[PDB]
Amino acid sequence: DFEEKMILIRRTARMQAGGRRFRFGALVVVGDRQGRVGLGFGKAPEVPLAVQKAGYYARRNMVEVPLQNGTIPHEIEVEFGASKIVLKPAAPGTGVIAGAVPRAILELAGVTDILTKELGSRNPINIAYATMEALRQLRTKADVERLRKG
């Protein structure tokens, strides 16, 4: 099991001749607060259907973030097209100082103290995809000296 926190739920509408059919989108993250997050983005015509589908994709697609002291190894300024997010690691005992979108991604990675800024466009989908790209780009001292020791 994981903590299963949803970020945004949105109800997107395609046009049929007649009404306009909806499709509830739902961006959950799953996290054990150990260093594993998953970003699932389910699109279902019903809402608990959307939360179940998104949790299914999120548990299916995980990423191990290599934490240290409950925070992050290095400063990382990643981008997802127009949405760019910086993460500056903190001295511990500072709090997850982040937006409402990546605060849950970091807090379900189980960081404690991280200093971010949702730059660029702050769209809750793109920022979460950028944050998964950040925590998949995150490297520590051991697994960079392993790539330099040759």
Partner RNA sequence: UAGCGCCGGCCAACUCCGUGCCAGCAGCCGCGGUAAUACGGAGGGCGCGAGCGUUACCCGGAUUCACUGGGCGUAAAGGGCGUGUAGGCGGCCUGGGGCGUCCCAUGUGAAAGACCACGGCUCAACCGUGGGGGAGCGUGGGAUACGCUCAGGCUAGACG
Partner RNA sequence: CCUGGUCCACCCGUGACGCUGAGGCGCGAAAGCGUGGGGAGCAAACCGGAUUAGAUACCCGGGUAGUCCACGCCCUAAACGAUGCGCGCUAGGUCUCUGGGUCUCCUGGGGGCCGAAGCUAACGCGUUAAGCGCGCCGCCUGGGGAGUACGGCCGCAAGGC
Interaction of residue 142 with RNA, rule CB under 7 A: no
Instruction: Report the candidate in 13, 6, 12, 7 with the shortest Cα–Cα distance to residue 52.
Output: 6
Which string of x and - marks every residue 93-122 that binds RNA (by CB under 7 A)?
A: ------------------------x-xx--
Q: Is 82 in the site for RNA (CB under 7 A)?
A: yes
- Residue 136 tokens, joined: 């998949």
CA distance 5 to 111: 15
Q: Is 94 in the site for other proteins (CB under 8 A)?
A: yes
By CB under 8 A, is residue 87 in contact with other proteins?
no
Q: How far apart are the first and last CA of the chain?
A: 39
Question: Least distance in Å: CB of 73 to Mg ion?
Answer: 23
Closest distance of CB 6 from RNA, Å = 14
Measured distance CA(96)–CA(72) in Å, rounded:
11
Closest residue to Mg ion, judged by C-beta, is 79
* Identified binder of other proteins from the candidate list 59, 74, 84, 122, rule CB under 8 A: 74
Per CB under 8 A, residues contacting other proteins are 73-76, 89, 92-97, 100, 103-104, 112, 139-141, 144, 147-150
Per CB under 7 A, residues contacting RNA are 77, 79, 81-82, 117, 119-120
Per CB under 5 A, residues contacting Mg ion are 79
